[PDB]
Amino acid sequence: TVRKNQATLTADEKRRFVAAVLELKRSGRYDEFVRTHNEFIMSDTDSGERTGHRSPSFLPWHRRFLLDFEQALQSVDSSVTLPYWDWSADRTVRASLWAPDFLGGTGRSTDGRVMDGPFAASTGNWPINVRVDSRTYLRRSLGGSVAELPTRAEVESVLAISAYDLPPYNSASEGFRNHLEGWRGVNLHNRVHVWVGGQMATGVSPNDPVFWLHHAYVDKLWAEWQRRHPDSAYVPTGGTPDVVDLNETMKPWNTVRPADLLDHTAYYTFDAL
């Protein structure tokens, strides 16, 4: 399986991806992914146990999470794979990504409701069930809460950091992981969530299909980082409380460790790295 840049998908590839996503939704499997992410984002804390976020395992965790989703998508249409969104390149509301034939665009000013695309509430095909408030429609406010998406230069500065992560291994840490996550520095991953707005800026961010494309690229950036620093590897490597060490297993799966997800090629490759 090859994960391609969303901007390069053919009309038919976009069609099959959308159809597969909508089916996971109809069957009720999609909402469970949304729930899983929210539950973890709400429990991962700087002071205690953290697995999915603000911790060294943020990367392998979302890697495995995306694999689960891609596998579910493939169970619907075996030809489908997770595309990625290079937000440093496609940074305007005009990117093909936000077209009605793909993900739809930004929400209207009154209530942030997305009005076009296959995930607009009006289609009757994308009810927001797993939520934190009463609104049951997809919402977006592209570039509303934050002016700009990260630039290539800013991404490069983060990819230059040699250390994977550093004690205290949380949102206050220096190193690659935390800068990519965004809690410190120019802010990459976190700022993108904020830029999209709507459900994407909340704990139930997977409600927006763009969630998968965003994380597929963050995941690609980790792969590019490993290429830049072959002498650097996942840390910690043993005996660190509240943090998932290299050879320790990760929740919710329990049967996989960060050591099993370091090499993405065991599961997929990119159109270009």
User: Which parts of this chain interact with another protein (CB under 8 A)?
Assistant: 38, 41-42, 45-47, 54, 111-112, 131-135, 145-146, 168, 170-172, 182-183, 189-191, 193-194, 201-203, 205
**Least Cβ distance, residue 199 to another protein (angstroms):** 9
Q: What is the C-alpha separation between 21 and 13, in angstroms, rounded?
A: 12
In contact, 169 and 44? CB cutoff 8 Å: no
**Token code pair at residue 196:** 């999209």
Q: What is the C-alpha separation between 243 and 68, in angstroms, rounded?
A: 22
Per-residue contact track with Cu ion, 53 to 72, x per CB under 5 A?
--------------------
The residue with its CB nearest to Cu ion is 42
Residue 188's identity, in one-letter code, is: L
**Least Cβ distance, residue 242 to another protein (angstroms):** 12
Looking at beta carbons only, is 22 or 194 nearer to another protein? Answer: 194
Cα 86 from chain centre: 12
**Token code pair at residue 70:** 């891609």
Which span (39-47, 102-110, 231-239, 248-256) binds Cu ion, by CB under 5 A?
Answer: 39-47
**Token code pair at residue 262:** 């370091």
Q: What is the C-alpha separation between 179 and 220, in angstroms, rounded?
A: 15
Looking at beta carbons only, is 42 or 233 nearer to Cu ion? Answer: 42
Looking at beta carbons only, is 118 or 206 nearer to another protein? Answer: 206
- Using DSSP, state whether 155 is helix, strand or coil: helix
Residue 202 backbone dihedrals phi, psi, to 5 degrees: -110, 175
Q: What is the C-alpha separation between 196 and 144, in angstroms, rounded?
A: 8
Of Cu ion, another protein, none, which one sits near residue 182, judging by CB under 5 to 8 A according to partner kind? another protein
Nearest Cα neighbor of 272 from 84, 10, 13, 78 is: 84
List binding-site positions. 37, 53, 62, 174, 179, 189, 193, 215
Of another protein, Cu ion, none, which one sits near residue 171, judging by CB under 5 to 8 A according to partner kind? another protein
List binding-site positions for Cu(+). 37, 53, 62, 189, 193, 215
Of another protein, Cu ion, none, which one sits near residue 209, judging by CB under 5 to 8 A according to partner kind? none
Looking at beta carbons only, is 29 or 131 nearer to another protein? Answer: 131
Q: Confirm or reject binding of residue 132 to Cu ion (CB under 5 A).
A: no
Q: What is the C-alpha separation between 184 and 168, in angstroms, rounded?
A: 13
**Token code pair at residue 5:** 């840049």
**Least Cβ distance, residue 147 to another protein (angstroms):** 13
**Least Cβ distance, residue 120 to another protein (angstroms):** 18
Chain contacts with Cu ion (rule: CB under 5 A): 42
